Amino acid sequence: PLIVPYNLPLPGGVVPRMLITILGTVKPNANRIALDFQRGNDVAFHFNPRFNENNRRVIVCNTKLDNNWGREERQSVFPFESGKPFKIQVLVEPDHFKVAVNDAHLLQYNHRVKKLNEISKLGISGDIDLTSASYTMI
Ligand SMILES: OC[C@H]1O[C@@H](O[C@H]2[C@H](O)[C@@H](O)[C@H](O)O[C@@H]2CO)[C@H](O)[C@@H](O)[C@H]1O
């Protein structure tokens, strides 16, 4: 498959209408997954499913600027399942990232980092087997 952590360059940054698709399988005793859209050392959008935060499943989203995390946005709808295959799609819209999992809308994250053309790498990490990571324009 692909080695994790995996770094997917996004040449020239992100732009509205760009669709990123990630296919993989959650490992059986997974603890976390993370997608990190980076602008240099900053993390424009961190998407972090947590399988056991105080015995609860939660998705945490945030931005890291100058090595400091901002205000978390938390989602209790949790579509990932230990041991099972998933598809994550991230659609860049003008004002938000829009995330769908297994073809169902999950969340939207308003752009905090506004220089979209400078968000030029995606890091994929955590307790997954990674099958495919790619992008296209819709
Ligand atoms: O916000 C994303 C960021 O969270 C860090 O963990 C936070 C944690 O979510 C919060 O409840 C606690 O009070 O502070 C921790 C440290 O900032 C993670 O360490 C980091 O990897 C990101 O996931």
Q: Note whether 72 and 59 are within 8 A (CB).
A: no
Cα dihedral 8, 102, 116, 44 in deg (nearest 10) = -80
Give the domain range for residue 119: 1-138
Annotated binding site: 69-75
Which CATH number characterizes residue 106's domain? 2.60.120.200
Tell me how far the alpha carbon of residue 137 lies from the centroid of ligand 1, in angstroms. Answer: 32
> Strand 18-26 to strand 128-137: parallel, antiparallel, or no bridges (unpaired)?
antiparallel
Rounded Cα distance between 132 and 53, Å, is: 28
Measured by CA distance, the residue closest to atom 12 of ligand 1 is 72
When divided into structural domains, the chain yields a total of 1
**Expt. technique:** X-ray
Tell me how far the alpha carbon of residue 136 lies from the centroid of ligand 1, in angstroms. Answer: 31
Among 138, 137, 133, 135, smallest CA distance to 6 is for 133
Cα 137 to its chain centre, rounded Å, is 18
Q: Over the chain, what HEC string results?
A: CECCCEEEECCCCCCCCEEEEEEEEECCCCCEEEEEEEECCEEEEEEEEEEEECCEEEEEEEEEECCEECCCEEECCCCCCCCCEEEEEEEECCCEEEEEECCEEEEEEECCCCCHHHCCEEEEEECEEEEEEEEEEC
Give me the resolution in angstroms, 1 decimal: 1.7
